[PDB]
């Protein structure tokens, strides 16, 4: 099953082959060695992080 973890910020972003965003996630409590690329549909109510990254 999936595990929800708390996000600290978004570090970078890219497109998948289907034109949807994927986001490089800094996880709360962890450093840059644990960053993972996550598709947008993994994210729950993360619009503010996305706006903060695009804003910035």
């Amino acid at each position: 099953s999936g595990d929800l973890y708390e996000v600290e910020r978004i570090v970078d972003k890219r497109k998948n082959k289907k034109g949807k965003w994927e986001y490089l996630i800094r996880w709360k409590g962890y450093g840059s060695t644990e960053d993972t690329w996550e598709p947008e549909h993994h994210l729950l109510h993360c619009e503010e992080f996305i706006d903060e990254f695009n804003g910035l």
Partner: peptide, 5 residues
């Protein structure tokens, strides 16, 4: 929160 792969 977000799912972690």
């Amino acid at each position: 929160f977000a799912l972690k792969s």
